[PDB]
Amino acid sequence: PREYEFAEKILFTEEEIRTRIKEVAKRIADDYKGKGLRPYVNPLVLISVLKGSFMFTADLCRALCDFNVPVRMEFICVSSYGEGLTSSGQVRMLLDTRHSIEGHHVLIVEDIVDTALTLNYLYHMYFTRRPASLKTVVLLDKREGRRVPFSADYVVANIPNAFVIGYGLDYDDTYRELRDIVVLRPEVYAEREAA
Amino acid sequence: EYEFAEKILFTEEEIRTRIKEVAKRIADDYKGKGLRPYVNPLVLISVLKGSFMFTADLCRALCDFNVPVRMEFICVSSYGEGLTSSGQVRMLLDTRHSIEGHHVLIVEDIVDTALTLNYLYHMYFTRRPASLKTVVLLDKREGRRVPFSADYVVANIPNAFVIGYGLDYDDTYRELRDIVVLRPEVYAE
Amino acid sequence: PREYEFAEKILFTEEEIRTRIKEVAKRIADDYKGKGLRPYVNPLVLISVLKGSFMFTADLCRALCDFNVPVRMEFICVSSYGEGLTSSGQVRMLLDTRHSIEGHHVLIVEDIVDTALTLNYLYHMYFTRRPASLKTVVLLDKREGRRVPFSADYVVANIPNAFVIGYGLDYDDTYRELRDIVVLRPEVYAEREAARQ
Amino acid sequence: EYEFAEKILFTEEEIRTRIKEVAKRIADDYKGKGLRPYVNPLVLISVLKGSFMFTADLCRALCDFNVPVRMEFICVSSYGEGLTSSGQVRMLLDTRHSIEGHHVLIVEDIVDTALTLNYLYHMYFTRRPASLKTVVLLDKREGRRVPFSADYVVANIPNAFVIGYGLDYDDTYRELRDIVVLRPEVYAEREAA
Numbered sequence: 001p002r003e004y005e006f007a008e009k010i011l012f013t014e015e016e017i018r019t020r021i022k023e024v025a026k027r028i029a030d031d032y033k034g035k036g037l038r039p040y041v042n043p044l045v046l047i048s049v050l051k052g053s054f055m056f057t058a059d060l061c062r063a064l065c066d067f068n069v070p071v072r073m074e075f076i077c078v079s080s081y082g083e084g085l086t087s088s089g090q091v092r093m094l095l096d097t098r099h100s101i102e103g104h105h106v107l108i109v110e111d112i113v114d115t116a117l118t119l120n121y122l123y124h125m126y127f128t129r130r131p132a133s134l135k136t137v138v139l140l141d142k143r144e145g146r147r148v149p150f151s152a153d154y155v156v157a158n159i160p161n162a163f164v165i166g167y168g169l170d171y172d173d174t175y176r177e178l179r180d181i182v183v184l185r186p187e188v189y190a191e192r193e194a195a
Numbered sequence: 196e197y198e199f200a201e202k203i204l205f206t207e208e209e210i211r212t213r214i215k216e217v218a219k220r221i222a223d224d225y226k227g228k229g230l231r232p233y234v235n236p237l238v239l240i241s242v243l244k245g246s247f248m249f250t251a252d253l254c255r256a257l258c259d260f261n262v263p264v265r266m267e268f269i270c271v272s273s274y275g276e277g278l279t280s281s282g283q284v285r286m287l288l289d290t291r292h293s294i295e296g297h298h299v300l301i302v303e304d305i306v307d308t309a310l311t312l313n314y315l316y317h318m319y320f321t322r323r324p325a326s327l328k329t330v331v332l333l334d335k336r337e338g339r340r341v342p343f344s345a346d347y348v349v350a351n352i353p354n355a356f357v358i359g360y361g362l363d364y365d366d367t368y369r370e371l372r373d374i375v376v377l378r379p380e381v382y383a384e
Numbered sequence: 385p386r387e388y389e390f391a392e393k394i395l396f397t398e399e400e401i402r403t404r405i406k407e408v409a410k411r412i413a414d415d416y417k418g419k420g421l422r423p424y425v426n427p428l429v430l431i432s433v434l435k436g437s438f439m440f441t442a443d444l445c446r447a448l449c450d451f452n453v454p455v456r457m458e459f460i461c462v463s464s465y466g467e468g469l470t471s472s473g474q475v476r477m478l479l480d481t482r483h484s485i486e487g488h489h490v491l492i493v494e495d496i497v498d499t500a501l502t503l504n505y506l507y508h509m510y511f512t513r514r515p516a517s518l519k520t521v522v523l524l525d526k527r528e529g530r531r532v533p534f535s536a537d538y539v540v541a542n543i544p545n546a547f548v549i550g551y552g553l554d555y556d557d558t559y560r561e562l563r564d565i566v567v568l569r570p571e572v573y574a575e576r577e578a579a580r581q
Numbered sequence: 582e583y584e585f586a587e588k589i590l591f592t593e594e595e596i597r598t599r600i601k602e603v604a605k606r607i608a609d610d611y612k613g614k615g616l617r618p619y620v621n622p623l624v625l626i627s628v629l630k631g632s633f634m635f636t637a638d639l640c641r642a643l644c645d646f647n648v649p650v651r652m653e654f655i656c657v658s659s660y661g662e663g664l665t666s667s668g669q670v671r672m673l674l675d676t677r678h679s680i681e682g683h684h685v686l687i688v689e690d691i692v693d694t695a696l697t698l699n700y701l702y703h704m705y706f707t708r709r710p711a712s713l714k715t716v717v718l719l720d721k722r723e724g725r726r727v728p729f730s731a732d733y734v735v736a737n738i739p740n741a742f743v744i745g746y747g748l749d750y751d752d753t754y755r756e757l758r759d760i761v762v763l764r765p766e767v768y769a770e771r772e773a774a
Contacts, residue, residue: 058250075270077268081679090679128667176266177264177266283513285480289478321474322474445755455756461674479656556619563644579619
């Protein structure tokens with residue numbers, strides 16, 4: 001009984017999404033129980049990629065806190081070199097991390113991986129900085145869309161190819177604030193591209 | 196329950212209750228203003244790092260009230276002065292879209308001195324939004340060194356090591372669901 | 385002499401430009417001899433706006449050194465929000481200064497001022513940071529084009545409205561490396577606007 | 582003449598002579614490559630701060646040899662170590678255009694350990710330029726902690742406090758026309774402050 005005129009259907013309710021986030025966080029806590037994480041000196045660093053991941057991250061890190069996984073939050077932001085071309089997957093860095101990741105355990109946090117061109121690019125970039133470990137967690141995975149092989153370590157949910165909006169995800173910087181992940185109506189998409 | 200914490204100021208639930216009230220208050224203030232998606236959203240300029248969690252919950256609460264928003268994130272850092280009287284900060288990351296002619300709400304985590312907030316407000320004003328307001332998670336009014344009234348306040352506090360819900364000590368404890376008071380012992384160590 | 389197929393004419397040779405840079409610098413030295421400038425503690429801070437000013441700045445600060453004016457270089461960079469053009473003059477900050485300007489003597493260095501919408505925006509921004517003083521120097525002044533009143537304190541040269549290129553100035557990020565400031569042929573402009581289609 | 586300087590390593594004029602030589606060498610290396618303005622320029626990624634003055638002169642000299650260029654500037658800063666083995670740095674400002682498919686020349690002021698330069702090279706490489714070289718103003722090869730050869734070098738130096746021509750000490754002396762050696766006394770006195 002959350003309803004949206006602009007959406008064909010709902011894919012994931014807030015609650016479904018929170019349940020999966022809890023499951024992903026449990027797994028993470030488990031995979032890192034061996035690594036002796038500690039606040040200040042050795043937290044799991046969450047490199048959250050803006051804007052899309054801002055919501056996922058806010059929910060994810062509280063779920064992580066529930067499993068006593070201590071975390072350091074970093075926020076980066078990158079922008080497309082508006083080509084369409086790019087097989088390097090290259091993006092423009094607009095905000096890089098405040099602290100060194102070297103020797104720390106890092107988790108890159110992203111909202112959507114389809115092509116993985118950009119995630120792969122950012123994985124490689126942060127890998128060459130010699131963190132103790134480096135893994136990826138993604139809100140949505142659209143494996144159908146890969147142009148470079150890449151497996152996220154953690155996945156909240158899989159999706160097919162559609163205009164996916166909400167829960168931080170946007171169409172034209174709109175609809176990020178929805179509590180649910182929903183499928184944008186093609187008519188709404190078409191009407192907005194005319195404008 | 197938290198070993199490093201003197202006490203719990205606000206539980207997650209209290210916090211979400213206040214945020215819903217603030218959200219309703221905003222929805223009421225902007226109903227005359229004709230907000231519309233794409234063309235006229237309320238722009239939230241969320242100041243990193245401390246406001247990230249507040250902003251995630253706040254924009255969802257605003258969505259419950261059919262307030263269409265646009266999310267922008269900016270990031271500033273301190274110049275290594277003991278303390279500055281202009282409230283100047285270094286711009287690391289700035290809005291993606293122009294704010295000219297839009298309704299803008301700046302979202303901050305904590306306001307004490309307001310020097311920084313006043314500087315940002317003034318900067319954002321000269322950019323000619325249709326209107327500008329600020330919402331803050333925690334107001335420490337005791338602390339002001341410049342005159343500044345937040346339009347929306349989630350909760351007032353005294354002076355204290357306040358951590359949790361996005362707020363840090365040495366980039367630690369931002370992940371907590373509650374806002375809590377640090378032990379001075381843990382601070383000293 | 386240098387020659388260029390893509391240019392209607394030369395407006396300023398390298399040597400013409402260096403002479404005016406020297407004259408400007410002498411003036412700056414003279415205006416600040418009273419202010420007790422000193423290296424490390426109290427230099428004249430040059431806020432150089434990229435990309436356009438890079439070459440101007442490199443030449444200007446050597447000239448300033450010739451008149452014993454100690455300087456600190458800062459480089460900022462900003463980008464247009466893709467509004468055709470806006471009345472606030474607002475731009476996006478991509479790179480801000482490394483050190484505080486509070487209490488320092490600051491000179492903002494720009495390549496071209498026409499509307500002054502953006503330079504006014506940047507003057508105001510740095511002014512509210514409370515430097516000891518804040519002035520502007522511009523390579524080229526197109527006073528004809530103002531949409532906000534604004535007077536640069538120092539001007540290397542005035543120009544009329546033309547595609548001005550060279551000496552750091554670009555068309556489509558091309559021709560910045562020229563030693564001279566020249567006028568781009570409208571035919572070349574038209575050929576290039578069609579081409580990215 | 583400069584009171585704060587033991588000696589002059591290179592005069593402005595010597596520097597311009599070397600830069601002209603390096604520029605010729607580049608113009609020769611890329612003649613087979615079909616550089617053209619707008620569509621296929623040699624992209625100079627000039628690293629701020631210290632390379633600003635070199636970059637200004639170098640691109641003018643390159644223009645003398647009809648080498649079409651695109652100027653990009655990047656700016657990075659140190660993470661709070663003494664130093665680091667990955668040679669990582671923090672990205673503050675990045676290129677405006679993509680470097681995919683272009684010929685790229687990275688322009689640096691000074692290479693000692695090469696850790697930073699090695700990291701930038703590698704990052705830029707993964708961006709798939711058609712080709713990638715580096716040109717440096719001063720090479721301090723004695724100091725390498727990772728193997729790296731600059732393709733173009735304006736001048737080699739020993740180990741010294743080197744200042745001028747864009748190179749600084751505590752963000753001072755970048756404006757000098759010559760490259761000069763700092764007096765250690767001047768160094769000690771300022772460290773005090």
